C-alpha cells in the first residue's frame, strides 16, 4: 500500500490527502 | 491535508459577494429566480439592505 | 449507517405486524412463535427484540427457515441466506 | 538597432521555437529571454553593485535550495568571469527546479551576450560566432517524448 493507511504520502495514493472537493 | 485555493464548489446558490483588487471594485451576482429582472429586483433590494449598515 | 436513520425492514415489518395479532414477542419471554414468517427480501436489518421468530429467508431458489436467538440482533438478515458454495 | 534571427531547433523527437531576442534597452539595462524546457524565463541586466542576483523576487539561495542547482544557475556566469558587477533581475515560469536553473542560465547567457558580443553567440553577424559562452546560448529544446499512444503490451 506504500503506507496506504497512515502516512502523509500513501494517503495521496488513496486520494485522501487531497481532500475531496464538495461536488455532486 | 491539501485543498485548492479556488474552491469553486456547488450544490448551492447565493448572491456571491466578491471584490476585485485589480480595479478596486466589488462584485455581487444573481442566481435565485429564473428571469434576469426578478434577480435585478432581488439584488436591488439587497443593495438597499446593504446600505442599512 | 446509524447516523441519519439506521434501520430498514419495511416488508419484514408488514409481516411482523401480521404476526402481531396476539403478541409481537410473546407478550401473552418467548415461545418460538410457531406461525412461520417468510420474508421475500434479505436487505432488511434486524431490530432489538424480534427474538423467537421463525424467519424464512429467500436465497434465490427457495425459502430458508432459521430461528433467531439473542446473538443475531445487530445484524442484517441477508447474512443468513447464502448461495451454498460449500465445496 | 539591427538584430537578426538567432534561433535554433536543435532537439531530437520534438522541435522548439524561442522566437524571443536578446536586446539592450535605452535604460542601459539589457533584457533577454530564455527557456530550456517548456518552462520559461526572462532576464533583465543592470551593471550594478546593488541587490546582486534575483529570480522570482527572493534572493536566490532560498528559492533554489539545492547547491548543485545553484551552480547550474551560476555556470554561464562563472564561465564568463564577470560575476559581481551586474545586478541580475530575472523572472521564471513553469516546470521543475533545475530546469528552471538551466533555463535561467541560458537567459542570463543571452543578456551577457548583448552586453559583450564576443563571449557568446548572437545574430549580430549572420547568426554565427564563437566564444566560451557561445555554446550555451542556443537552448536545448528537447522536451519529454509524449507518453506513447499505444501499449506497454508486454
Amino acid at each position: 500500500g506504500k503506507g496506504d493507511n497512515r502516512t502523509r504520502r500513501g494517503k495521496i495514493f488513496r486520494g485522501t490527502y487531497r481532500e475531496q472537493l464538495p461536488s455532486h | 491535508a491539501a485543498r485548492a485555493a479556488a474552491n469553486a464548489a456547488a450544490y448551492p446558490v447565493d448572491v456571491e459577494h466578491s471584490f476585485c483588487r485589480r480595479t478596486r471594485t466589488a462584485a455581487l451576482s444573481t442566481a435565485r429566480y429564473g428571469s434576469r429582472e426578478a434577480n435585478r429586483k432581488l439584488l436591488l433590494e439587497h443593495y438597499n439592505e446593504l446600505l442599512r449598515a | 449507517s446509524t447516523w441519519k436513520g439506521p434501520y430498514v425492514a419495511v416488508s419484514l415489518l408488514q409481516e411482523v405486524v401480521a404476526l402481531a395479532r396476539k403478541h409481537p414477542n410473546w407478550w401473552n419471554i418467548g415461545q418460538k412463535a410457531p406461525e412461520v414468517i417468510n420474508t421475500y427480501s434479505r436487505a432488511s436489518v434486524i431490530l432489538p427484540d424480534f427474538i423467537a421468530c421463525r424467519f424464512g429467508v429467500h436465497n434465490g431458489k427457495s425459502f430458508v427457515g432459521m430461528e433467531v436467538q439473542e446473538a443475531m440482533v445487530g445484524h442484517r438478515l441477508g447474512e443468513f441466506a447464502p448461495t451454498k458454495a460449500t465445496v | 538597432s539591427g538584430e537578426a534571427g538567432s534561433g535554433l531547433a536543435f532537439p531530437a523527437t520534438s522541435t522548439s521555437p524561442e522566437p524571443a531576442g536578446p536586446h539592450i534597452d535605452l535604460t542601459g539595462v539589457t533584457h533577454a529571454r530564455g527557456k530550456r524546457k517548456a518552462s520559461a524565463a526572462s532576464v533583465q541586466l543592470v551593471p550594478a553593485g546593488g541587490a546582486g542576483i534575483t529570480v522570482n523576487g527572493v534572493p536566490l539561495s532560498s528559492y533554489f535550495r539545492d547547491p548543485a542547482c545553484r551552480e547550474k544557475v551560476l555556470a554561464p556566469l562563472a564561465l564568463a568571469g564577470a560575476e559581481t558587477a551586474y545586478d541580475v533581475a530575472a523572472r521564471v515560469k513553469g516546470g521543475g527546479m533545475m530546469g528552471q536553473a538551466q533555463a535561467i542560465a541560458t537567459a542570463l547567457a543571452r543578456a551577457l551576450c548583448v552586453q559583450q558580443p564576443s563571449l557568446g553567440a548572437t545574430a549580430g553577424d549572420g547568426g554565427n560566432g564563437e566564444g566560451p559562452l557561445a555554446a550555451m546560448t542556443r537552448w536545448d529544446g528537447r522536451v519529454v517524448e509524449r507518453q506513447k499512444p499505444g501499449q506497454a503490451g508486454s
Partner: protein, 164 residues
Amino acid sequence: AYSVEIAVQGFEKRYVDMACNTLGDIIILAFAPKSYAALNLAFGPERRDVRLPWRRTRITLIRGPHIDKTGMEQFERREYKSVLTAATNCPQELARLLEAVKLYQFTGVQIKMQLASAQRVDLPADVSALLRXXXXXXXXXXXXXXXXXXXXXXXXXXXXXXXX
C-alpha cells in the same frame, strides 16, 4: 456610458474569422461619423481585438469493435475564440448593434455578449439620508442559454450602478 464585449466561439477558424471581421465592420459602421457637420467619439485606448488560445483536451477511442485493446485512436475538439471590444455613450446606436446582431445569422458560431453599462438607481430616502465613493458596480445578471430552443446567441449583460 455603455461598454460592449462580444465573445465568439467556433470550430472552423474560417467561420470565426469571418464573424470577427464582419462584426468589426459593424462596430466601425455603428459609430461612424458619416458626415462632418455635427462637429464625443470613443476610439479611446481601451479598444482592442484580443485573440486567444484554446482549451487543449484530447479524447481517445478504441479503434476496434471487440477485443482489439491494442487498437487505440486519438480524437479531439477545437474551440477558437476572439473577443471584440468597444464602448459608447448614446443608446440608439447600441440598439442598432443589438438589432444588427439580431439580423445577420452566423453559421455554427456562438455569440456570447457582455454589456456592462450605467443605469440609474432609486433608493429609499432613509438610506440616502443615512449616507449623509468607490466603484461598487455590482449587478452581474445571469441568464440561461439552452434547453429552450436556442443555439446560443445568448446575451448576458452585467450592469453598473450609480447612486452618489
